[PDB]
Amino acid sequence: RQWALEDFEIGRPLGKGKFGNVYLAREKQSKFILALKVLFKAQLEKAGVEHQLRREVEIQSHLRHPNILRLYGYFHDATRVYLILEYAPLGTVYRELQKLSKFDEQRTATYITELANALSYCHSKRVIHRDIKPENLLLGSAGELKIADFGWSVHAPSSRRTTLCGTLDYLPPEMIEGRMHDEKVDLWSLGVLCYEFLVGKPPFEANTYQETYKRISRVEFTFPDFVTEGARDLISRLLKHNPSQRPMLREVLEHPWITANSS
Ligand SMILES: CN1CCN(c2ccc(C(=O)Nc3n[nH]c4cn(C(=O)Cc5cccs5)cc34)cc2)CC1
Ligand SMILES: [As]
Ligand SMILES: [As]
């Protein structure tokens, strides 16, 4: 089906980014509520990522999983590229985290299960190394997690330090120490994410980025007294310096703390 701008009506902005914006939208015929991400070819070419957009939209286009925000279609014109995306009505996990300061164990274990399931699916399709920070996670109508780390910034919502290798807070030891990485980086990210969910802040925070790099290399992090032994065991396992010793996603999904707290 060849979509066109004429097929949609655009509503309020859901986000503003460097490459473009994202709006609430409705498809003329079905009257279905979606999200329309609008990217400007000008900024795309300026960054020499024009061809890379279509290639990335191609792989994402075929990823169908309940915890991965669906990318339905795409069309373009002389100056803009339009991405038709599933609408997640409850917003970002990040905003929920700010509102509550931290998540309880049941909510956290549930999100971890959903992310582990989605990652499992992606890894099987050879899709790896994702930016799974709270700001890139949306929530469905039932509160289910929707991974939306397609990239191509069209929103904020924070000033967390990022690098060409990824979000600094989430960078694994291998990337900081100059070694080549593999899909095991996603397990480390899952450990950092779980920690942030339960604590409200990243485990390697420091007075300077230089010191953060050092603490990641030494896997130097501690927990607040309120985190339980079950959570500590899973996170400690995920945050192992040796990539190969981090648990398999199957082992995460079957971890005692996860099975006991995940809905
Ligand atoms: C109590 N609440 C407060 C705020 N509320 C919403 C605030 C924001 C949203 C929202 O962004 N929804 C989206 N749905 N599909 C998308 C593709 N998006 C991006 O590509 C842009 C991205 C943003 C993050 C990752 S990718 C973004 C969306 C929904 C509700 C309503 C009621
Ligand atoms: As993925
Ligand atoms: As890199």
Tab-separated table of C-alpha atoms and ligand atoms in Angstrom:
chain	number	residue	atom	x	y	z
A	1	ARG	CA	0.000	0.000	0.000
A	2	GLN	CA	1.456	3.344	-1.103
A	3	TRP	CA	0.759	5.889	1.622
A	4	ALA	CA	0.871	9.631	1.044
A	5	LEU	CA	0.650	12.712	3.258
A	6	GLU	CA	-2.891	13.234	1.941
A	7	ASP	CA	-3.868	9.992	3.682
A	8	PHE	CA	-3.338	11.449	7.162
A	9	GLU	CA	-4.404	14.346	9.358
A	10	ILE	CA	-1.777	15.509	11.829
A	11	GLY	CA	-2.486	16.602	15.392
A	12	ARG	CA	-0.521	17.848	18.397
A	13	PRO	CA	3.256	17.405	18.614
A	14	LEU	CA	4.422	14.439	20.693
A	15	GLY	CA	8.043	15.455	20.335
A	16	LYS	CA	10.602	17.778	18.768
A	17	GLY	CA	14.052	16.571	17.744
A	18	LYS	CA	17.137	17.513	15.742
A	19	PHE	CA	16.217	15.457	12.690
A	20	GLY	CA	12.519	16.264	12.873
A	21	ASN	CA	9.331	15.915	14.905
A	22	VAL	CA	6.658	13.384	15.828
A	23	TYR	CA	2.923	14.048	15.921
A	24	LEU	CA	-0.314	12.357	16.832
A	25	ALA	CA	-2.063	11.473	13.571
A	26	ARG	CA	-5.124	9.718	12.187
A	27	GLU	CA	-5.372	7.752	8.942
A	28	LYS	CA	-8.212	9.244	6.839
A	29	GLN	CA	-10.047	6.016	5.967
A	30	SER	CA	-9.798	3.732	9.005
A	31	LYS	CA	-9.659	6.689	11.397
A	32	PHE	CA	-6.933	4.715	13.206
A	33	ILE	CA	-4.792	6.727	15.660
A	34	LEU	CA	-1.059	6.591	14.906
A	35	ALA	CA	2.116	8.620	15.414
A	36	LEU	CA	3.787	10.311	12.448
A	37	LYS	CA	7.529	10.922	12.669
A	38	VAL	CA	8.655	13.637	10.256
A	39	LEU	CA	12.334	13.832	9.285
A	40	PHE	CA	13.940	16.544	7.136
A	41	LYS	CA	16.084	15.312	4.247
A	42	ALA	CA	18.186	18.452	4.694
A	43	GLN	CA	19.489	17.438	8.121
A	44	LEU	CA	19.737	13.827	6.972
A	45	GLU	CA	22.078	14.619	4.077
A	46	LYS	CA	24.018	17.165	6.132
A	47	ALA	CA	24.909	14.251	8.418
A	48	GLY	CA	25.451	11.907	5.473
A	49	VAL	CA	22.833	9.447	6.716
A	50	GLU	CA	20.335	9.652	3.843
A	51	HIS	CA	20.753	6.085	2.541
A	52	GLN	CA	21.095	4.688	6.074
A	53	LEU	CA	17.572	5.810	6.971
A	54	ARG	CA	15.850	3.598	4.386
A	55	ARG	CA	18.067	0.647	5.224
A	56	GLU	CA	17.253	0.973	8.933
A	57	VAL	CA	13.529	1.467	8.246
A	58	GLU	CA	13.694	-1.782	6.253
A	59	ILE	CA	14.911	-3.970	9.100
A	60	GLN	CA	12.621	-2.255	11.633
A	61	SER	CA	9.722	-2.599	9.199
A	62	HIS	CA	9.811	-6.385	9.621
A	63	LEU	CA	10.217	-6.574	13.399
A	64	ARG	CA	6.849	-7.647	14.765
A	65	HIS	CA	6.719	-8.149	18.504
A	66	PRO	CA	4.234	-6.862	21.099
A	67	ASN	CA	7.000	-5.062	23.033
A	68	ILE	CA	8.606	-3.366	20.041
A	69	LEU	CA	6.860	-0.224	18.780
A	70	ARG	CA	5.548	-1.061	15.326
A	71	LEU	CA	6.776	0.894	12.303
A	72	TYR	CA	3.919	0.449	9.812
A	73	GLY	CA	5.042	2.254	6.706
A	74	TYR	CA	6.940	5.185	5.291
A	75	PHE	CA	6.755	7.686	2.444
A	76	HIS	CA	8.619	10.840	1.486
A	77	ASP	CA	8.705	13.946	-0.662
A	78	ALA	CA	11.176	16.569	-1.861
A	79	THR	CA	12.212	17.616	1.645
A	80	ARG	CA	10.824	15.160	4.204
A	81	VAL	CA	10.652	11.485	5.138
A	82	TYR	CA	7.560	10.271	6.996
A	83	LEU	CA	7.496	7.280	9.332
A	84	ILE	CA	4.110	5.808	10.247
A	85	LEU	CA	4.367	4.465	13.791
A	86	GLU	CA	2.180	2.733	16.329
A	87	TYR	CA	0.848	5.171	18.942
A	88	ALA	CA	1.780	4.442	22.586
A	89	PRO	CA	-0.833	6.354	24.687
A	90	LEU	CA	0.831	6.195	28.125
A	91	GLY	CA	4.030	7.947	27.041
A	92	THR	CA	7.628	7.308	28.067
A	93	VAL	CA	8.805	5.044	30.872
A	94	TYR	CA	11.222	7.884	31.657
A	95	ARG	CA	8.416	10.298	32.541
A	96	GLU	CA	6.906	7.642	34.836
A	97	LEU	CA	10.312	7.180	36.467
A	98	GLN	CA	10.587	10.929	37.124
A	99	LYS	CA	7.107	11.044	38.602
A	100	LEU	CA	7.708	8.188	41.054
A	101	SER	CA	11.516	8.601	41.489
A	102	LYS	CA	11.953	4.801	41.209
A	103	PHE	CA	9.896	1.682	40.408
A	104	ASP	CA	8.838	-1.110	42.767
A	105	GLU	CA	10.050	-4.666	42.128
A	106	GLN	CA	6.914	-5.945	40.398
A	107	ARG	CA	6.863	-3.122	37.863
A	108	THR	CA	10.614	-3.435	37.236
A	109	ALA	CA	10.697	-7.222	36.885
A	110	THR	CA	7.781	-6.925	34.470
A	111	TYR	CA	9.590	-4.416	32.243
A	112	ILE	CA	12.764	-6.531	32.343
A	113	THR	CA	10.818	-9.598	31.214
A	114	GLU	CA	9.262	-7.638	28.362
A	115	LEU	CA	12.630	-6.219	27.299
A	116	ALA	CA	14.362	-9.598	27.586
A	117	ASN	CA	11.622	-11.133	25.399
A	118	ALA	CA	11.961	-8.376	22.798
A	119	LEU	CA	15.770	-8.589	22.825
A	120	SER	CA	15.574	-12.368	22.436
A	121	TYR	CA	13.422	-11.885	19.332
A	122	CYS	CA	15.754	-9.238	17.933
A	123	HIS	CA	18.938	-11.198	18.552
A	124	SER	CA	17.421	-14.107	16.630
A	125	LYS	CA	16.916	-11.714	13.704
A	126	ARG	CA	20.534	-10.596	14.134
A	127	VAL	CA	19.470	-7.188	15.477
A	128	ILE	CA	21.802	-6.182	18.317
A	129	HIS	CA	23.312	-3.330	20.345
A	130	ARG	CA	20.244	-1.225	21.109
A	131	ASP	CA	19.885	1.985	23.113
A	132	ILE	CA	17.442	0.792	25.774
A	133	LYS	CA	17.381	3.722	28.151
A	134	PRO	CA	14.138	4.844	29.871
A	135	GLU	CA	13.816	7.778	27.430
A	136	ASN	CA	13.550	5.299	24.521
A	137	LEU	CA	10.788	3.209	26.082
A	138	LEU	CA	7.088	3.915	25.547
A	139	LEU	CA	3.997	2.399	27.179
A	140	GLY	CA	0.933	0.857	25.540
A	141	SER	CA	-2.688	1.283	26.620
A	142	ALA	CA	-2.348	-1.619	29.058
A	143	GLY	CA	0.948	-0.314	30.380
A	144	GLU	CA	3.009	-2.769	28.343
A	145	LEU	CA	6.542	-1.758	27.399
A	146	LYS	CA	7.124	-0.657	23.786
A	147	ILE	CA	10.765	-0.407	22.723
A	148	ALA	CA	11.234	2.598	20.467
A	149	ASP	CA	14.981	2.982	20.039
A	150	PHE	CA	14.887	3.328	16.250
A	151	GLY	CA	16.943	6.485	16.678
A	152	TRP	CA	16.886	9.522	14.398
A	153	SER	CA	16.023	11.962	17.183
A	154	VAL	CA	12.613	13.609	16.857
A	155	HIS	CA	12.241	14.208	20.593
A	156	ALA	CA	14.198	14.900	23.786
A	157	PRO	CA	13.292	14.362	26.813
A	158	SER	CA	16.611	14.587	28.681
A	159	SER	CA	20.199	15.854	28.437
A	160	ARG	CA	21.860	12.528	29.293
A	161	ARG	CA	25.403	12.339	27.874
A	162	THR	CA	25.624	10.469	24.574
A	163	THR	CA	28.562	9.482	22.366
A	164	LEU	CA	29.028	7.916	18.933
A	165	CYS	CA	29.366	4.614	20.789
A	166	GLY	CA	26.125	5.144	22.686
A	167	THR	CA	24.751	6.609	25.904
A	168	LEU	CA	27.674	7.095	28.299
A	169	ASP	CA	25.818	5.800	31.390
A	170	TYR	CA	25.094	2.553	29.538
A	171	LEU	CA	28.484	1.941	27.878
A	172	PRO	CA	29.947	-1.500	28.742
A	173	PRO	CA	33.587	-2.077	29.830
A	174	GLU	CA	34.526	-3.523	26.428
A	175	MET	CA	33.584	-0.308	24.639
A	176	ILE	CA	35.405	1.850	27.194
A	177	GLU	CA	38.548	-0.272	27.137
A	178	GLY	CA	38.855	-0.276	23.355
A	179	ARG	CA	37.734	-3.816	22.547
A	180	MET	CA	35.309	-4.877	19.820
A	181	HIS	CA	31.833	-5.836	21.059
A	182	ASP	CA	29.004	-8.279	20.349
A	183	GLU	CA	25.371	-8.888	21.384
A	184	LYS	CA	26.455	-9.348	25.012
A	185	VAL	CA	26.504	-5.570	25.272
A	186	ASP	CA	22.691	-5.754	25.436
A	187	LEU	CA	22.846	-7.822	28.645
A	188	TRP	CA	25.041	-5.177	30.254
A	189	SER	CA	22.534	-2.518	29.152
A	190	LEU	CA	19.757	-4.574	30.714
A	191	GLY	CA	21.695	-4.578	33.996
A	192	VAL	CA	22.157	-0.800	33.947
A	193	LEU	CA	18.480	-0.332	33.026
A	194	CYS	CA	17.257	-2.617	35.822
A	195	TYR	CA	19.422	-0.695	38.276
A	196	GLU	CA	18.087	2.666	37.094
A	197	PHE	CA	14.501	1.390	37.390
A	198	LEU	CA	14.979	0.292	40.996
A	199	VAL	CA	17.250	3.125	42.108
A	200	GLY	CA	16.252	6.072	39.953
A	201	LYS	CA	19.796	6.787	38.729
A	202	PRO	CA	22.571	5.039	36.687
A	203	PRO	CA	25.015	2.830	38.653
A	204	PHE	CA	28.222	4.462	37.389
A	205	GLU	CA	27.353	8.113	37.994
A	206	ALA	CA	30.384	10.199	39.059
A	207	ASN	CA	31.555	13.817	39.433
A	208	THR	CA	33.131	13.674	35.985
A	209	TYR	CA	32.664	11.616	32.840
A	210	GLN	CA	36.323	10.640	33.131
A	211	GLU	CA	35.606	9.072	36.516
A	212	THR	CA	32.496	7.374	35.135
A	213	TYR	CA	34.630	5.676	32.474
A	214	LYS	CA	36.947	4.433	35.203
A	215	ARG	CA	34.151	3.084	37.404
A	216	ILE	CA	32.623	1.209	34.466
A	217	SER	CA	36.019	-0.355	33.716
A	218	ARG	CA	36.360	-1.450	37.352
A	219	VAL	CA	32.665	-2.456	37.482
A	220	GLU	CA	32.549	-0.304	40.577
A	221	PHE	CA	28.942	0.190	41.650
A	222	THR	CA	26.918	-0.267	44.828
A	223	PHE	CA	23.252	-0.609	45.796
A	224	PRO	CA	21.045	1.405	48.190
A	225	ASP	CA	19.976	-0.577	51.265
A	226	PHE	CA	16.428	-0.982	49.914
A	227	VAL	CA	17.291	-3.118	46.853
A	228	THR	CA	16.586	-6.791	47.630
A	229	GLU	CA	18.997	-9.714	47.401
A	230	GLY	CA	17.150	-11.114	44.401
A	231	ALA	CA	17.542	-7.890	42.429
A	232	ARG	CA	21.179	-7.578	43.498
A	233	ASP	CA	21.978	-11.054	42.185
A	234	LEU	CA	20.494	-10.466	38.730
A	235	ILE	CA	22.090	-7.047	38.298
A	236	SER	CA	25.467	-8.225	39.590
A	237	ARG	CA	25.311	-11.037	37.034
A	238	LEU	CA	24.352	-8.722	34.193
A	239	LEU	CA	27.088	-6.237	35.059
A	240	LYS	CA	29.993	-8.688	34.781
A	241	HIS	CA	33.150	-7.318	33.174
A	242	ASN	CA	33.604	-10.418	30.988
A	243	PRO	CA	30.887	-10.215	28.260
A	244	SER	CA	30.732	-13.998	27.844
A	245	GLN	CA	29.952	-14.507	31.529
A	246	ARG	CA	26.851	-12.297	31.504
A	247	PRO	CA	23.734	-14.532	31.600
A	248	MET	CA	21.857	-15.650	28.490
A	249	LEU	CA	18.508	-13.917	27.935
A	250	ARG	CA	16.823	-17.265	28.644
A	251	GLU	CA	18.537	-17.311	32.040
A	252	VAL	CA	17.339	-13.760	32.753
A	253	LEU	CA	13.758	-14.721	31.917
A	254	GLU	CA	14.061	-17.702	34.289
A	255	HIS	CA	15.856	-15.905	37.112
A	256	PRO	CA	14.121	-16.471	40.510
A	257	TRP	CA	13.699	-12.738	41.146
A	258	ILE	CA	12.142	-12.260	37.704
A	259	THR	CA	9.736	-15.197	37.863
A	260	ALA	CA	8.695	-14.199	41.365
A	261	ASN	CA	7.989	-10.543	40.579
A	262	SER	CA	7.112	-10.330	36.879
A	263	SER	CA	3.489	-10.101	35.761
B	1	LIG	C1	-0.012	11.313	31.740
B	1	LIG	N1	0.501	11.293	30.342
B	1	LIG	C2	1.549	12.350	30.152
B	1	LIG	C3	2.126	12.387	28.706
B	1	LIG	N2	1.330	11.644	27.634
B	1	LIG	C4	2.015	11.096	26.414
B	1	LIG	C5	3.291	11.597	26.007
B	1	LIG	C6	3.945	11.090	24.879
B	1	LIG	C7	3.356	10.049	24.097
B	1	LIG	C8	4.148	9.559	22.908
B	1	LIG	O1	5.237	10.066	22.656
B	1	LIG	N3	3.652	8.557	22.124
B	1	LIG	C9	4.188	7.879	20.948
B	1	LIG	N4	3.517	6.965	20.344
B	1	LIG	N5	4.184	6.458	19.258
B	1	LIG	C10	5.352	7.198	19.293
B	1	LIG	C11	6.572	7.210	18.425
B	1	LIG	N6	7.378	8.248	19.149
B	1	LIG	C12	8.648	8.609	18.756
B	1	LIG	O2	9.177	8.098	17.764
B	1	LIG	C13	9.463	9.629	19.595
B	1	LIG	C14	10.008	8.893	20.844
B	1	LIG	C15	9.898	9.261	22.152
B	1	LIG	C16	10.500	8.325	22.997
B	1	LIG	C17	11.056	7.262	22.329
B	1	LIG	S1	10.839	7.401	20.632
B	1	LIG	C18	6.671	8.824	20.338
B	1	LIG	C19	5.370	8.105	20.384
B	1	LIG	C20	2.080	9.544	24.491
B	1	LIG	C21	1.423	10.056	25.625
B	1	LIG	C22	-0.173	11.492	27.853
B	1	LIG	C23	-0.622	11.313	29.338
B	2	AS	AS	15.611	-4.747	19.387
B	3	AS	AS	31.716	2.437	18.071
